[PDB]
Amino acid sequence: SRPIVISGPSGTGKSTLLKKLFAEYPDSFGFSVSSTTRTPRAGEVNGKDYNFVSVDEFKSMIKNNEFIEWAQFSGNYYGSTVASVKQVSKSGKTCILDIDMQGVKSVKAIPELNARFLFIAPPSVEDLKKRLEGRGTETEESINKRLSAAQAELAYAETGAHDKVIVNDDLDKAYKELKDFIFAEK
Numbered sequence: 001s002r003p004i005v006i007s008g009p010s011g012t013g014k015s016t017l018l019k020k021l022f023a024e025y026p027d028s029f030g031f032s033v034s035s036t037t038r039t040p041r042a043g044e045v046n047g048k049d050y051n052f053v054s055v056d057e058f059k060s061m062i063k064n065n066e067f068i069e070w071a072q073f074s075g076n077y078y079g080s081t082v083a084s085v086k087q088v089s090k091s092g093k094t095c096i097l098d099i100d101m102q103g104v105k106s107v108k109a110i111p112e113l114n115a116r117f118l119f120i121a122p123p124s125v126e127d128l129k130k131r132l133e134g135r136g137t138e139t140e141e142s143i144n145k146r147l148s149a150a151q152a153e154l155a156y157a158e159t160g161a162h163d164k165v166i167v168n169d170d171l172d173k174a175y176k177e178l179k180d181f182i183f184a185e186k
C-alpha cells in the first residue's frame, strides 16, 4: 500500500512501538533499511537495522542518484534508498520509513511516493529531558541540542504536516492509536 513515514525524537519509545508492530504483523509490513556511514552499535545487524557502508560508497550512492532522500547527522550520512523501498513494496508489504524531520520534508516534496506521515511525540519536552538525563550516556551539550531539535519538530507538526500525531504517554495506548491509524487504509 502507500508507504508510511514515521518520525519523532529519539527517547519517546518509538523503537518499541515499531517492534511490537513487526512482531504482530510480520507479513504485512516491511522496514526501509537506511544506509548509514556511522559505526554500528551493540545489537545492530547489518542489512536489518541499517546498511552500514563506507563514506566512499555513500558518496557513490549520492552521485549515482540511489537515494530517495539523504542527510547528515553528527558528521555521518544517512539515507533512504530507492532500492530498499521498492523491494518491500514490490514484496507486497507496506513499507515503513523511520527518518527524521529533514527526511520528512524531503519525502513530502516527492508527490509520487504518496506517503502517509505519522509523528510520535513525547508527552512533553520536560519529560524527554528526564529520559535523556536518565540514561547517563549524553552530555549537557548534546541534550540541549536534542531538546532544540525536538522543539523544532513539535513546531513543524503544528503546521499540519503530518496525517496524524500520536503522543506516546503509554506504550499500549499509543500502540492502539498506531494500529487505528495504519489500518484506516488511506
Ligand SMILES: Nc1nc2c(ncn2[C@@H]2O[C@H](COP(=O)(O)O)[C@@H](O)[C@H]2O)c(=O)[nH]1
Pocket: 010, 034, 035, 038, 069, 070, 071, 073, 078, 079, 080, 098, 099, 100, 102, 103, 104
Ligand atoms: N533523513 C534520514 N534520517 C534518518 C535516516 N535513518 C536514520 N535517520 C535518523 O538519524 C538520526 C540518528 O539515528 P541513529 O544514529 O540514532 O540511528 C535519527 O533522527 C534517525 O531518525 C534516513 O534514512 N534518513
